[PDB]
Write a protein that binds this ligand. Sequence first.
Ligand SMILES: Cc1cc2nc3c(=O)[nH]c(=O)nc-3n(C[C@H](O)[C@H](O)[C@H](O)COP(=O)(O)OP(=O)(O)OC[C@H]3O[C@@H](n4cnc5c(N)ncnc54)[C@H](O)[C@@H]3O)c2cc1C
Ligand SMILES: Nc1nc2c(c(=O)[nH]1)N[C@H]1C(S)=C(S)[C@@H](COP(=O)(O)O)O[C@H]1N2
Ligand SMILES: N#Cc1cc(-c2n[nH]c(C3=CC(=O)NC(=O)C3)n2)cc(=O)[nH]1
Ligand SMILES: N#Cc1cc(-c2n[nH]c(C3=CC(=O)NC(=O)C3)n2)cc(=O)[nH]1
Ligand code: FES
Ligand code: FES
Ligand SMILES: [Ca+2]
Ligand SMILES: [Ca+2]
Lengths: 50, 1293, 99
Amino acid sequence: CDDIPRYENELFLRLVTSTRAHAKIKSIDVSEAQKVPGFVCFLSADDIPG
Amino acid sequence: ADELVFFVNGKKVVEKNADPETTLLAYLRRKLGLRGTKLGCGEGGCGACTVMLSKYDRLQDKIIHFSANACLAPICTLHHVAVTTVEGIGSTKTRLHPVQERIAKSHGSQCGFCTPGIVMSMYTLLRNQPEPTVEEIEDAFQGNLCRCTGYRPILQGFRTFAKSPSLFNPEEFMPLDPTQEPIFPPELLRLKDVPPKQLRFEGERVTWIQASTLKELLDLKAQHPEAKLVVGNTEIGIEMKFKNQLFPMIICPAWIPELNAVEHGPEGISFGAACALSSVEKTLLEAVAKLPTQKTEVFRGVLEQLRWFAGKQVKSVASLGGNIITASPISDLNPVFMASGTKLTIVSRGTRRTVPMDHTFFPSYRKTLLGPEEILLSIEIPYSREDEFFSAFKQASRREDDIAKVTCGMRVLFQPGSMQVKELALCYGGMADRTISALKTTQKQLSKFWNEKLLQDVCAGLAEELSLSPDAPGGMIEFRRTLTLSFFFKFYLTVLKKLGKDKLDPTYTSATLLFQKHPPANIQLFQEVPNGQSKEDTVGRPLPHLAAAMQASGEAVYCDDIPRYENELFLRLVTSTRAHAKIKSIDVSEAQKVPGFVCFLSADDIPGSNETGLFNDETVFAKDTVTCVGHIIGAVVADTPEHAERAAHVVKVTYEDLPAIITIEDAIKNNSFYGSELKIEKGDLKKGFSEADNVVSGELYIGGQDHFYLETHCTIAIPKGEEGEMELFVSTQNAMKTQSFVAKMLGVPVNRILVRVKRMGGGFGGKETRSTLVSVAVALAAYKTGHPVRCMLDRNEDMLITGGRHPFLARYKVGFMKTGTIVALEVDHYSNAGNSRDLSHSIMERALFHMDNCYKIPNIRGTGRLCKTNLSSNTAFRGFGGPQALFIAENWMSEVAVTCGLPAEEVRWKNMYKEGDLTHFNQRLEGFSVPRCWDECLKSSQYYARKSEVDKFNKENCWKKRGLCIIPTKFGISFTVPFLNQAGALIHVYTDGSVLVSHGGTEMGQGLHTKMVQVASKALKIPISKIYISETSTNTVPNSSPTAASVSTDIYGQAVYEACQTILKRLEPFKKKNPDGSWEDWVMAAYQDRVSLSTTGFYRTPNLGYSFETNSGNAFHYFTYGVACSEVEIDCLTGDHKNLRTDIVMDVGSSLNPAIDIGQVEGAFVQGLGLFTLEELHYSPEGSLHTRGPSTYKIPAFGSIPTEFRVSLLRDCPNKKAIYASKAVGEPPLFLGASVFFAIKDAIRAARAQHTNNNTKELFRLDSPATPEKIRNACVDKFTTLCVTGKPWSLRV
Amino acid sequence: EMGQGLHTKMVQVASKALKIPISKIYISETSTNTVPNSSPTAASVSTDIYGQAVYEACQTILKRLEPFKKKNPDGSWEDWVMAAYQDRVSLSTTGFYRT
Ligand SMILES: Cc1cc2nc3c(=O)[nH]c(=O)nc-3n(C[C@H](O)[C@H](O)[C@H](O)COP(=O)(O)OP(=O)(O)OC[C@H]3O[C@@H](n4cnc5c(N)ncnc54)[C@H](O)[C@@H]3O)c2cc1C
Ligand SMILES: Nc1nc2c(c(=O)[nH]1)N[C@H]1C(S)=C(S)[C@@H](COP(=O)(O)O)O[C@H]1N2
Ligand SMILES: N#Cc1cc(-c2n[nH]c(C3=CC(=O)NC(=O)C3)n2)cc(=O)[nH]1
Ligand SMILES: N#Cc1cc(-c2n[nH]c(C3=CC(=O)NC(=O)C3)n2)cc(=O)[nH]1
Ligand code: FES
Ligand code: FES
Ligand SMILES: [Ca+2]
Ligand SMILES: [Ca+2]
């Protein structure tokens, strides 16, 4: 799979995962993430169209 | 300076390193990933790259919006400009804009490749005039071309913006709402405030300075006199791309206020030299409405030329000074500027002069009297004076967006209130290498009076003074000379009229009329579906092409639109510049030095076989010898397409010529044929000829045709790196041959090669085989590099290399009775096949099969020979030999009517086959519907009433004539080699109950997939929404015949039907167990029960197999029929004509989709009209093509179609021989375009009775295409007489 | 294929069923548009079940090619395949198995 050449416009995804075994998600803060050079977006449940 | 800032669809683009050579089109497709905007030609002719531009004009103090060709727009002109592309206005993921909605729903998109550019031209009009007039609408598209639709639906759909069941419903159209339009970028409006300043861009090869002030400009021209000015780039863009000019320094003066000012002075109106021609046009139109007629004579000449100058895209960026200083011999403006003494204000640093343009201003080819330091600042177009009159005329190959043959400006100034010539200026383009004045002719007339003797003297003087030698560039010697006289005659008559106030001499009055549009009327008639039919059964309903909305939105993916891999490379073909030569050596040493160069590939690089072609006739890369101009020798592969192009251009081939054989004639004389003669003989010719009252024999020629699919040939090849595996994305009608020619070249099993075809932007037969020329080269580059490689041809390469329709030369003899009844016939056909066999033999056979058209001829012999020549190999082109043969048949039929002195329709009718007769190849005509088509078309076209109206018009008009002709056609349906009539399909039903269909056919705009989906949905009894077709691929359906012969709906439809039956058989017990369940419940239960939800389907046409030796057995499964009646009006002084009205009745059985079938009728029709009247390829005598682009090759334009255009599909004619009682439609109607040609012939006969003949039974030869040249030269008269063929001491008798 | 040699076994199986060498057969990949609704490759039954699927498809090819073998007993695989193609016999089929 990863040996397949990337398209010129091909992007990379990194999962964001929980550090707690059982907990409510109070908030999510992406503001330091957006500062990282090359950030395109952060995706979460609300982005799902289906 | 360094930064370039602009906006694209509302979003800011900051380009830090703009290269001056980057066009917008390249930037949009390759840097911004916005692939809706397309490349179709690269020379401003086709409009596929049309976008909108918006800017603040701080001078009108207003946001302005205009359209432009992205392929010619340098991004370096666009600082502080907002670009709107097709993706800027809507999409199927959000909402279509009204323009996109309507063109899709009104069936104005087929292949869809022209659609975004036509969308953008209509959108642009709407942003300027939210409620346009019908004419403002047609005019919006002078620079857009469509090869598929025949234009009618696009216009009829867009007409709903102005002011039988039906193919569309305008009441469902969302109204335009200008408050919902994208807002002009607010950042850009903040910027209008800041004073502009000089910018500098630096690219690989070119430095560009954007001059902010006149002083900056004139300083820069002093410092850099060699620097090239650029405004619209519509000429420099061509010189750069097509003549390998490099201008290492550009100055763009477009922003400078004095170069854009318009002033109304006592003497005339003054425009800065950077004023677009669209501004010039608007200003003059307003002057012409406001001012006394006698002030505006010169202005109206300018306007008359601007009417026929390029199109909206070009006119909106092309500048006035750009036209004057380019000094093309064929400028339409400079003759007018020169005739008028229009004033040029010319400046340099510390210099200013003003001169009247006159004959000295253009000293020689492409030069003007401007010095190295000097710029054209402003132009004063003068007011006309009392006693001063002016005309301008342009004649071309086509009226819309064409390059002038002869073009002129004519001024006379009389002594006050007299007819006594004080001044006369007759100034012409196209008669020499610069714009010239006939000063010798006109000097002789000063003090003379405007009369008959003056007309005669000027004609005689023009004939002497504007001579052309037989060798003149452009040819068309007699036509060009006739036109210089004809135009003068029009001027002479126009001036007579203007001199006498304002009845003077009717019969003559129409020669003086400027071109004028009658309003369009279009009626389509087809059958409603049976009343009880389910709404979910769409078979027989006018469902839009399934991809039409995505074509309109730019979201449909064509091959080059597929994203590049990051390591993907670019191939450029290296082709022969000689017709016939040994290759002595190849030197790549300059190519190696172009940046990004990767490798040059040639014959030695091939690991498998260099032998390719349908008959194993050809090389993949030429070895030892080249046998045509365009013969592929090699290829350069580089990191960008520009590096590849530049590198290939500088690959040096050294040749030693060999004797060439170019023409049919040469080939006959040299015994140069492929194979041996083909023949069908039936009955007894000698006996036939001996019993005929009359016998006519003659010779007929029909020229070839370039496919001009809007998407040229394109392949992407992906090498996998494992077991020789390769995956190709290809624009082709033939994935099977592509797959096997790529495997043969690589020397790998066919199971290693996967070919995928999503869609083509047109194919028309030209992608039936010739697509492998590019496919196999790209495969070689992928194999050799291990990288993805791609290549899309530029238009010029495509036209040169890939082949076209076959030219035919016929020698015939027909014996007939006095009643018109044909008694015997012989025709010998010769086709120009080019340098390989390809489909030529099958093309000849199809010609022989159609030599009868619809006529019963008891004694008949047809022969065919294929001429082997040093020209690119010709191939399939819609009709596949049929139209040539059928044109030959109608030519001699028409000569039969003339010789008999009988009405042409009577002679055709009495000769017509009847129900059950055998053809000349002994096939029975069962369900022969031509008499019903014929009867209905006579009637619905009101033919007989109109005949009498045409005679009347002809009686009353000396210099225009009308013509009217009605012709039948029949077209045999099947591939003539029996093995190709087979089709497979593969159908999957997934467990959500969605169905994916795959079949061997490809989509090229004809709506095959839409039809297959309609079939599957009727067969399965589910809605089409549940069914989907993604693409055509060799690992889903193997061994497919090319999508060709118009049988794809027939044969794939049956294969899809059969897979549906199997699925239905598997589901039946689940249906039984649960009668009240849904399709979804039944599918899930069959899955849970371990019943397969996948099957193949297959079909093989029964009862086929014609033998040329027994002359028996079915050649075809059935025939498609129809009839067309066309009326034209020709202009006998120029060779222009108008197509006034056409009515078509076509038998397509019970249509699967009447929208799609009417689209096919009209598209085919218009493609045939192009073949028979507009389109013409020219080659030098040594075999090198001249016509390589839409500038010179003229296909039907929006303005070319019949103004009244009516199409009916025959009611109540089910075809038991094909799926759901339908008939094949793709090619049958194309020969109906010949009704235009024969109407033209009738109108020529009329003109020659007017001024040539008392001989009503005379037979003059009119070859195809009947272009303005052939029509004009055929209108023999007192002007032709003065400038014919090429005083002697020295005269016998 | 996950390392277990299933494509290899399948090529072995097809070669034996069609009586042609393994060199004339190839398996490129697995995809939902060539075989739909597949169970996961799992429970060690893939050879068993795809083996039968491949075998049934090979039988169907053999039935279709038989009249050409019969007409030309001394011919090559390649001769029989070309003849079927020229005679418009389909050279594509599915295969299926249910334990
Ligand atoms: C599809 C198409 C159809 C066309 N149809 C026609 C037609 O029917 N009739 C016709 O006449 N032409 C036609 N043209 C030609 C072309 O569009 C015109 O000549 C146009 O006016 C050139 O203007 P431009 O601003 O694009 O010139 P550019 O390409 O930008 O410049 C052309 C030349 O003019 C010089 N120049 C420009 N401005 C100045 C200045 N102020 N002072 C000194 N030199 C200057 C440049 O240095 C350059 O040599 C057509 C072109 C295309 C692409
Ligand atoms: N829009 C469009 N219509 C088209 C073509 C095309 O390329 N584009 N090709 C024509 C030719 S040459 C043929 S043989 C048929 C192929 O399609 P069919 O067999 O599905 O009719 O479509 C015809 N109509
Ligand atoms: N449309 C179009 C059009 C196409 C064809 C046709 N296309 N390919 C072939 C082949 C002929 C052959 O002799 N050998 C081959 O491998 C292929 N014939 C026939 C027709 O009647 N109309
Ligand atoms: N190895 C491995 C392995 C796998 C399985 C197994 N895989 N999928 C399921 C499912 C069960 C179900 O109820 N619904 C489903 O959609 C799937 N069972 C069985 C086994 O014996 N060995
Ligand atoms: S691509 Fe620009 S006009 Fe054809
Ligand atoms: S739809 Fe216009 S070129 Fe095909
Ligand atoms: Ca072609
Ligand atoms: Ca050929």
